Amino acid sequence: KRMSMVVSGLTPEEFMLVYKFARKHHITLTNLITEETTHVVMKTDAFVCERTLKYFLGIAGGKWVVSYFWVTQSIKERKMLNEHDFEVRGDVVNGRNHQGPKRARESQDRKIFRGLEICCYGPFTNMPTDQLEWMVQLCGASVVKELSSFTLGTGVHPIVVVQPDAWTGFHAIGQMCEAPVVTREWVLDSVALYQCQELDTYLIPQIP
Amino acid sequence: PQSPTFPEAG
């Protein structure tokens, strides 16, 4: 029942008129991305963006992920253009091709990490552990906190996600619990496409 | 400074 938007991938300069725009038309504009937020406006080209945290969390949430062009061209006219003509279509995972954003809000009855359990293990760079955990949770996944917190129950698939990028051994994991060990980029890639890429190329070689 | 981005796939 509420319109609430958040911005991603702009300069302070460009953010200004998203603010001026917000107040003009009575739209709530928030600092950080929440669960009420229904709109993610972000910078494109005429409509491709860079992958931001808010980007992944927008697609994950099934939100409207609309370009910044929506604001520039609705001021250039006079009225509020309807975002539907302005939703993003890619980044550099997907070209302007595999429009994930659309795919997500349309396929909510059918989440991607549906029958899976995910441990976000170890250090991560510019995406806090819990923030990622939430991105996963939105896409049907169940989050686990230790490696020894995986379910006996047979219907479930254990998957350990690590960002190796931020360490200094992590081919280790496999020994401790027996579940596939994948780079973070598998989560990231899966949301951006909203498709759930198979584990093959994201699998981390392990030491027996 | 600004918002973090995320580069290439796997």
From Swiss-Prot, chain A:
Changing residue 58 to E: In BC; pathogenic. Signal peptide: none annotated. Changing residue 186 to R: In BC; pathogenic; functionally impaired in vitro. Residues 1-88, 108-204 form the BRCT domain. Changing residue 140 to V: In BC; pathogenic. Changing residue 90 to R: In BC; pathogenic. Changing residue 118 to S: In BC; pathogenic. Changing residue 19 to A: Does not abolish ABRAXAS1 binding, but impairs formation of a heterotetramer with ABRAXAS1. Phosphorylated in response to IR, UV, and various stimuli that cause checkpoint activation, probably by ATM or ATR. Phosphorylation by AURKA regulates centrosomal microtubule nucleation. Changing residue 23 to E: Impairs formation of a heterotetramer with ABRAXAS1. Changing residue 60 to E: In BC; abolishes ACACA binding. Changing residue 122 to V: In BC; pathogenic; functionally impaired in vitro. It comes from the Eukaryota. Changing residue 67 to R: In BC; pathogenic. Changing residue 185 to K: Slightly reduces affinity for a BRIP1 phosphopeptide. It is linked to Breast cancer: A common malignancy originating from breast epithelial tissue. Breast neoplasms can be distinguished by their histologic pattern. Invasive ductal carcinoma is by far the most common type. Breast cancer is etiologically and genetically heterogeneous. Important genetic factors have been indicated by familial occurrence and bilateral involvement. Mutations at more than one locus can be involved in different families or even in the same case. Heterodimer with BARD1. Part of the BRCA1-associated genome surveillance complex (BASC), which contains BRCA1, MSH2, MSH6, MLH1, ATM, BLM, PMS2 and the MRE11-RAD50-NBN protein (MRN) complex. This association could be a dynamic process changing throughout the cell cycle and within subnuclear domains. Component of the BRCA1-A complex, at least composed of BRCA1, BARD1, UIMC1/RAP80, ABRAXAS1, BRCC3/BRCC36, BABAM2 and BABAM1/NBA1. Interacts (via the BRCT domains) with ABRAXAS1 (phosphorylated form); this is important for recruitment to sites of DNA damage. The BRCT domains recognize and bind phosphorylated pSXXF motif on proteins. The interaction with the phosphorylated pSXXF motif of ABRAXAS1, recruits BRCA1 at DNA damage sites. This is Breast cancer type 1 susceptibility protein. It comes from Homo sapiens. The lineage of its organism: Eukaryota, Metazoa, Chordata, Craniata, Vertebrata.
Curated annotation (Swiss-Prot), chain B:
Cytosolic enzyme that catalyzes the carboxylation of acetyl-CoA to malonyl-CoA, the first and rate-limiting step of de novo fatty acid biosynthesis. This is a 2 steps reaction starting with the ATP-dependent carboxylation of the biotin carried by the biotin carboxyl carrier (BCC) domain followed by the transfer of the carboxyl group from carboxylated biotin to acetyl-CoA. It comes from the Eukaryota. It is found in: Cytoplasm, Cytosol. Signal peptide: none annotated. The modification Phosphoserine is found at residue 3. This is Acetyl-CoA carboxylase 1. It is linked to Acetyl-CoA carboxylase-alpha deficiency: An autosomal recessive inborn error of de novo fatty acid synthesis associated with severe brain damage, persistent myopathy and poor growth. The chain holds residues 1261 to 1270 of 2346 of the full protein. Consists of an N-terminal biotin carboxylation/carboxylase (BC) domain that catalyzes the ATP-dependent transient carboxylation of the biotin covalently attached to the central biotinyl-binding/biotin carboxyl carrier (BCC) domain. The C-terminal carboxyl transferase (CT) domain catalyzes the transfer of the carboxyl group from carboxylated biotin to acetyl-CoA to produce malonyl-CoA. Monomer, homodimer, and homotetramer. Can form filamentous polymers. Interacts in its inactive phosphorylated form with the BRCT domains of BRCA1 which prevents ACACA dephosphorylation and inhibits lipid synthesis. Interacts with MID1IP1; interaction with MID1IP1 promotes oligomerization and increases its activity. Phosphorylation on Ser-3 is required for interaction with BRCA1. Expressed in brain, placenta, skeletal muscle, renal, pancreatic and adipose tissues; expressed at low level in pulmonary tissue; not detected in the liver. The gene is ACACA.
